[PDB]
Ligand binder design. Structure first.
Ligand SMILES: OCCN1C[C@H](O)[C@@H](O)[C@H](O)[C@H]1CO
Length: 666
């Protein structure tokens, strides 16, 4: 069993349950580089100058990770600039690819530093404070094989309901029924396809998890039905923090049953987030997990079929301890007359209390009757929150798939939900960031993923949103989302709405193909998006391409990500058909041979490339997933080619039936 994977154990590792496959502890010396326990733990490896390093799932910068530093330490940071070392995810899988090729999974739940050529260009160094971890070494002939080995042992990826392959609209600010009705009307009356509207935190009663503002929604199930009758499914948010409030059932049950994270003295740790003071459910405690997950029944019973989990790093605006320190410092500042306490020292203190490393040392988890300080298992919180929900869905309705995705994650969580790429910005560079994160996430098991289209923070423009949407066409999560106070970002808020209808039409025409590829990849522990080097390993030009991706085994995508651009350069590793969905509803095709090309792609055109000897089915445009006609779709691509289409009811879990597959021949 497991010939190509070995597990090297150091110290007394916390069981993260990342792997579903049990691997015995190897007894020989670590097989690559050098291991040191002199100062905590460190792995050091000298790379060949041609080596490529893949992996790290949701992390900064590019597909080839060489040339910077990455720290796995789930952090709420809304400014994703090139300098940042830590985002929301901790995905500790890397592959060194070159003359010598191997994969490593560092199963460690705390702060883990990947120095990938940052300090010295030839040096890979992975280090942490405590030598209590399992390291899995995965052997293979090439990077792709190694990923496929890893994907097997971590267990099958989460599978969403088919409606989740539609388009979704979201905004931090939708509050009332009139707000949601205006979104519904803005899309439906302009014939723009859409299947989901997300409800952000304002739908709750005073930000209380598992409540609904009954002044705004006096009969919430009727409203959910009003929307669902128009094939619009409401997707509400759930946050990590449970408001401290007398008589609020979730809070009262958590205190009484000791389901919250505690301080050293056993009192319930107070974290201030949106509701003000809150407690955090002890996500690492099975009983607390079951309790918290069960609460989703509150919304499910009202007709809700999907959720998103937010703030689950967990984010902290301040603790009671931090606020007191802050107010004391402020007092000294206010009465200084000697210029001893400067305004930036005050400013620094205010910043310091947010997501404070000290705060993460102030609370504990109850695991196996043992108290574990949170910092030591920090990266497992978001993971276990989403696990709580996922495990509850199986108890609540085991026949049914629910839409579920989370902000923070760790490998293992991919079994229970997807992720969205968090708080990006209305920056052109974030289209590229969205693109590059995709294959890396697929390597670590996270297939259902995407970014806030148009950009979350700051102000978008008509053309940025259109180019963002055109990449979104291909990402399983396709959601336009925007921050409070930003320029309105709904498709109907711009001139010439027909261009938005055109781009989102392309998504819906491609839904049968994209869903089919997702399912075939998920069911077979394979990738939906792949770097070119996985498909064309013998092409030195191909292995270094980072702004094109292969999807399934049929197509390649290459989005435009420059403002004012009317096309872009591409490298084709084999002959392909260059395809564009045109604003008049037609599909243009042009055969292009292997090599470098500049392709013209207008703002309202959606491009893709179909590989030699392949074809894909394309449906006529429909305005919701339910209405897509998959009976005799048109086949686009090469004569003589065939395609195996996976199709099921999109709702239940009857995956292994011959009726789910049909061969289409062009
Ligand atoms: O502190 C902010 C909390 N949230 C962060 C999420 O990333 C974002 O998508 C969401 O709109 C927002 C409000 O719910």
């Amino acid at each position: 069993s497991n010939a190509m994977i070995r597990k090297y154990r150091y110290g007394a590792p916390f069981d993260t349950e990342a792997l579903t496959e049990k691997i015995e502890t190897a007894e020989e010396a670590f097989p690559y580089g050098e291991i040191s326990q002199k100062e905590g733990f460190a792995f050091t490896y000298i790379m060949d100058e041609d080596d490529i390093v893949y992996g790290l799932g949701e992390s900064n910068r590019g597909i080839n990770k060489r040339g910077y530093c990455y720290i796995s330490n789930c952090t709420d940071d809304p400014i994703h600039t090139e300098d940042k070392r830590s985002l929301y995810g901790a995905h500790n899988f890397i592959i060194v690819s070159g003359k010598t090729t191997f994969g490593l999974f560092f199963d460690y739940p705390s702060k883990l530093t990947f120095d990938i050529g940052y300090t010295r260009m030839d040096t890979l160094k992975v280090s942490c404070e405590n030598a209590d971890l399992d390291i899995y070494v995965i052997e293979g002939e090439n990077a792709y094989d190694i990923v496929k080995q890893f994907r097997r042992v971590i267990g099958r990826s989460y599978i969403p309901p088919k409606f989740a392959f539609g388009f979704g609209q979201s905004r931090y600010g939708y509050t009332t029924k009139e707000d949601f009705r205006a979104v519904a009307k803005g899309y439906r009356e302009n014939h723009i396809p859409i299947d989901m509207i997300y409800m952000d935190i304002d739908y709750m009663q005073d930000f209380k998890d598992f409540t609904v503002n009954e002044k705004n929604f006096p009969d919430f199930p009727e409203f959910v039905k009003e929307m669902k009758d128009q094939e619009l499914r409401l997707i509400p948010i759930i946050d990590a923090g449970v408001k401290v409030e007398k008589g609020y059932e979730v809070y009262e049950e958590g205190v009484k049953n000791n389901y919250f994270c505690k301080r050293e003295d056993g009192s319930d740790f107070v974290a201030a987030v949106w509701p003000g003071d809150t407690h955090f459910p002890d996500m690492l405690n099975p009983e607390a997990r079951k309790w918290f997950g069960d609460k989703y029944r509150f919304l499910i019973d009202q007709g809700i079929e999907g959720f998103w989990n937010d703030m689950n790093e967990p984010a902290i605006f301040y603790s009671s301890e931090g606020l007191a320190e802050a107010k004391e410092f402020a007092g000294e500042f206010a009465k200084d007359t000697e210029g001893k306490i400067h305004p930036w020292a005050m400013q620094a203190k205010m910043k310091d209390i947010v997501n404070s490393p000290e705060d993460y040392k102030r609370f504990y988890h109850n695991v196996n009757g043992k108290k574990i300080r949170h910092d030591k298992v920090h990266n497992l919180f978001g993971y276990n929150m989403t696990r709580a929900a996922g495990e509850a869905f199986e108890r609540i309705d085991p026949e049914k798939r629910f839409l579920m995705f989370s902000r923070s994650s760790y490998i293992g969580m991919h079994r229970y939900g997807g992720i969205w790429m968090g708080d990006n910005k209305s920056w052109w560079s974030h289209i590229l960031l969205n693109l590059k994160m995709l294959p890396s996430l697929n390597m670590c098991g996270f297939m259902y993923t995407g970014a806030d289209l148009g950009g979350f923070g700051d102000d978008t423009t008509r053309d940025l949103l259109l180019r963002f949407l055109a990449l979104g066409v291909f990402t399983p999560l396709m959601r336009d989302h925007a921050a409070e106070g930003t320029r309105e970002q709904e498709c109907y808020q711009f001139e010439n709405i027909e261009d938005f209808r055109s781009v989102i039409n392309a998504r819906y025409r491609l839904v049968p193909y994209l869903y089919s590829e997702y399912m075939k990849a998920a069911l077979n522990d394979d990738m939906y998006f792949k770097p070119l080097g996985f498909v064309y390993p013998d092409d030195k030009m191909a292995i270094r391409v980072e702004d094109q991706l292969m999807l399934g085994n049929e197509i390649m995508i290459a989005p435009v990500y420059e403002q004012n651009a009317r096309g872009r350069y591409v490298y084709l590793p084999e002959e392909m058909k260059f395809i564009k969905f045109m604003p008049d509803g037609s599909i243009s095709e042009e055969v292009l041979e292997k090599g470098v090309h500049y392709v013209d792609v207008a703002l309202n055109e959606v491009p893709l490339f179909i590989r030699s000897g392949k074809c894909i089915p394309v449906a006529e445009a429909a305005e919701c997933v339910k209405d897509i006609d998959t009976e005799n779709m048109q086949l686009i691509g090469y004569e003589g080619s065939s395609y195996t289409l996976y199709e099921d009811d999109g709702i239940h879990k009857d995956y292994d039936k011959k009726e789910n597959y049909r061969v289409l021949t062009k």
